[PDB]
Structures are given as structure tokens and as C-alpha cells.
Amino acid sequence: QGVTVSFYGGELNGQTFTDPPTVKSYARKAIFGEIFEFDTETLNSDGIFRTSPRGW
């Protein structure tokens, strides 16, 4: 279907991506709502969601 992705606002503002691996990886993040850059290295984050103090 020739899917491309363009970003408005934020870090990647005005950028457009066309190669299907890159577009797919953003689409998979887009199922989570808004897309954020994350520092996984400081806490050795495992990539699996945890609940908030509201949940606990």
C-alpha cells in the first residue's frame, strides 16, 4: 500500500520515512498512542509495562 510516516511536532518534526521496516516499527509503537524516546540504559529497563502508584 506504499505506507509512509511523517512526524509533526516533537523530536522528528518535519521528517518523513518511507522504507517499510522503519515505517512498520513506528506503526508498532503507534498502537501505544503517542511515541516517545526512552532511556532504557540507566535503570536497565526490560521493555515490559509496569503499573503506576494508582494501580498499586
Binding site: 516517545f36 524516546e37 532511556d39 540507566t42 529497563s45 526490560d46 509495562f49 509496569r50 503499573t51 503506576s52
Partner: peptide
């Protein structure tokens, strides 16, 4: 807060990272 796990311990930052 409905995306967690009972034995997934620690802050939300421990999952996805520090935003």
C-alpha cells in the same frame, strides 16, 4: 495503570525506560 503485572516490580520507568 492497567498495563502492569503483579510480579513486574518497580517504577514504570523500569519497564519502558525513562521518557
Amino acid at each position: 495503570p492497567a498495563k502492569g503485572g503483579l510480579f513486574r516490580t518497580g517504577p514504570m520507568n523500569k519497564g519502558d525506560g525513562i521518557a
